[PDB]
Amino acid sequence: TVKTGIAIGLNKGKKVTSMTPAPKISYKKGAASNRTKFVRSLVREIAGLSPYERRLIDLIRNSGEKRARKVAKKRLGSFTRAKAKVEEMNNIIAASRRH
């Protein structure tokens, strides 16, 4: 950053010789891991797809990604998960029934 040292404006605020702390591991609560990557990969090919997931990829191959998001947003919570879910499908497809 660096603050401007005045009391309104863009990088508003008092100038302080600054420090940048050490990082909390509690900030990496999302991070993968080779262990969980491995497992999740494994479980998937055991249990396969699920009903709404089948409808997704077929909907992708037969109507495009935008119609898939729109559905998948309804199916899941929301547009952001739907984004992710469609992607995930796109990659079941590419990885498998392709290369």
């Binding site: 401007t4 005045i6 309104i8 008092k14 302080v16 600054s18 420090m19 702390p21």
Partner: protein, 193 residues
């Protein structure tokens, strides 16, 4: 039920409020007990003081950051620089706060220095047995008063380059205000073919 030129009141007394009246008839009582409590603790607590060493901290929000004020505990970094682990620092009557975070060196130094002064002015009786009687100072806080850092000098030369301060604020206000719009002209003019 409305008359004269009176100010409109709002006395919220339409629930069974008489059932929830607290009179501190016990104000004098609690003071005593509070005091008795403290006298009893000072005893039990042997020569230790009644409180922990607390860090200096700049206060939050626009309204209070001119003031500095006792924080909770010292931060894993400050304790480290101060030459001790926190496991121990805790057994030595230093409060340590694993969630507070250093981002400001002035305060950081202040606190480490607070720990140095503390460490040097305390004395830690051996585990053993001997217990070499040494009498209690009751307040870590009284002993080591948190004070407001001096930010300038009383008097000093005048330097006027000319730029209105006022108009500087005006201008700064402005830049932020149109930061977004100008970024859209910057995008929109980049898309010129």
């Amino acid at each position: 039920a409305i008359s004269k030129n009176l100010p409109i009141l709002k006395n919220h007394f339409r629930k069974h409020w008489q059932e929830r009246v607290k009179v501190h008839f016990d104000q004098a009582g609690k003071k005593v007990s509070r005091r008795n409590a403290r006298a009893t603790r000072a005893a039990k607590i042997a020569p230790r003081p009644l409180d922990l060493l607390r860090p200096v901290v700049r206060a939050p929000t626009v309204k209070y950051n001119r003031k500095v004020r006792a924080g909770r505990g010292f931060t894993l970094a400050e304790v480290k620089a101060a030459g001790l682990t926190a496991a121990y620092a805790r057994t030595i009557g230093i409060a340590v706060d694993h969630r507070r975070q250093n981002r400001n060196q002035e305060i950081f130094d202040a606190n480490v220095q607070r720990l140095k002064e503390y460490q040097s002015k305390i004395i830690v009786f051996p585990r053993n047995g001997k217990a070499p009687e040494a009498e209690q100072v009751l307040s870590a806080a009284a002993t080591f008063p948190i004070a407001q850092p001096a930010t300038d000098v009383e008097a000093r030369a005048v330097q006027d380059n000319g730029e209105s301060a006022f108009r500087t604020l005006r201008l700064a206000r402005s830049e932020k205000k149109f930061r977004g719009i100008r970024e859209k002209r910057a995008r929109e003019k980049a898309e010129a073919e």
